[PDB]
Design a protein around this nucleic acid. Structure first.
Ligand SMILES: Nc1ncnc2c1ncn2[C@H]1C[C@H](O)[C@@H](COP(=O)(O)NP(=O)(O)OP(=O)(O)O)O1
Ligand SMILES: [Cl-]
Ligand SMILES: [Cl-]
Ligand SMILES: [Mg+2]
Ligand SMILES: [Mg+2]
Ligand code: NA
Length: 327
DNA sequence: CGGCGTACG
DNA sequence: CGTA
DNA sequence: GCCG
């Protein structure tokens, strides 16, 4: 088992679901406390189990696995022995965990805002609604739409949204294309949002595109919320439903075609897969990776890529299709 | 011990 | 600060 | 919390 998640296939469904979910509770709780190092270790240990070919049944099967030391091994041991890990269950029922989870789930609220509200004594969404002077416009929209945004987006919803986006994109710039990214491209059947990447085959023609797209979607009455020159848009869309509609989060990103492979790779995720890939690039290969390119800081040159396959090759990694990037 | 991804709105 |  |  290699030490970086980008060195191994990770399928969406696997053989250690309960164990990985427990470790991910501890990771999440570490994040709520600002302990990014412990969050990473617990996330990485969970991802190792996702990559295994069969269930862990005995503690000895953790020997030699990367990111399993005393703490993660004890969590697994308790689950194998008793079906429950007391530390995990204490986190789950804690007022701190439940409230930080509730607040950070709001669009416009991160850990730092949630923690301040927590320290001020706030505990429920209605506590927040009562004191709207303390809310940004973004947070007001996130709170108004919270119930709909808590409902999974279905793969069956995505095709209708993509057609609507393509219509607006085609008027804004004929020839421009829309690619489905994020978790749906990794094979997820549900999501928290829909992520789309937009480009044009003629380098430079995509400049200034996203404002043109957004004002056309707004004119069609489809935009319940957006922040408005820009290249990323974090929107709330009106999605038709039988006899009604529901609010859905949609992310739009524009990239020039020269950067499209890097943007596709970055926006297809998973989040941990990309952090691990960028960590691998820099620490193992001395190259700096982001959603725009891959930089050699010694030659001061950028690596041209025409495909995701090119990028894996330039990093010395076996290619992984999106379905195997579910770290 | 230092390091832990890297951007844009 | 928020967001991907 | 774990790796190197
Ligand atoms: N902090 C981060 N660092 C690096 N890449 C990140 C990132 N956050 C997101 N990405 C990249 C990788 C992510 O896969 C992609 C989309 O971000 P989401 O839409 O927040 N997450 P997904 O679509 O995977 O699942 P779902 O929406 O169902 O929760 O952007
Ligand atoms: Cl930490
Ligand atoms: Cl980036
Ligand atoms: Mg998504
Ligand atoms: Mg998104
Ligand atoms: Na949030």
């Amino acid at each position: 088992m290699p030490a970086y998640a980008c060195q191994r296939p990770t399928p969406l469904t696997h053989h250690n679901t309960g164990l990985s979910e427990a470790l991910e509770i501890l990771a999440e709780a570490a994040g709520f406390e600002g302990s990014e190092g412990r969050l990473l270790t617990f996330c990485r240990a969970a991802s190792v189990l996702k990559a295994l070919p069969s269930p862990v049944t005995t503690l000895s099967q953790l020997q030699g696995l990367p990111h399993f030391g005393e703490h993660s091994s004890r969590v697994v041991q308790e689950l194998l022995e008793h079906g429950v890990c007391e530390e995990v269950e204490r986190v789950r029922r804690s007022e701190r965990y439940q409230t930080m989870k509730l607040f950070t789930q709001i669009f416009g609220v991160g850990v730092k805002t949630a923690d301040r509200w927590y320290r001020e004594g706030l505990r429920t969404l209605d506590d927040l609604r009562e004191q709207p002077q303390k809310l940004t416009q973004q947070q007001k929209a996130g709170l108004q739409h919270h119930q709909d945004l808590s409902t999974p987006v279905l793969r069956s919803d995505v095709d209708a949204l993509q057609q609507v986006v393509e219509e607006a994109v085609g008027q804004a710039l004929p020839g421009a294309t829309v690619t489905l990214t994020g978790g749906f491209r990794r094979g997820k059947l549900q999501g928290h949002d829909v992520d789309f990447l937009i480009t044009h085959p003629k380098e430079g023609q995509e400049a200034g595109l996203l404002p043109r797209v957004m004002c056309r979607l707004q004119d069609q009455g489809l935009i319940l919320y957006h922040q408005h020159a820009f290249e990323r848009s974090f929107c709330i869309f009106r999605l038709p439903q039988p006899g009604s509609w529901k609010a859905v989060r949609v992310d739009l990103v524009v990239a020039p075609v020269s950067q499209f492979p890097f943007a596709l790779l970055g926006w297809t995720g998973s989040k941990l897969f990309q952090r691990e890939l960028r960590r691998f690039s820099r620490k193992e290969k001395g190259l700096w990776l982001n959603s725009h390119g891959l930089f050699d800081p010694e030659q001061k040159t950028f690596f041209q890529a025409a495909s995701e396959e090119d990028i894996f090759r330039h990093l010395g990694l076996e290619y992984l299709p999106p379905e195997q990037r579910n770290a």
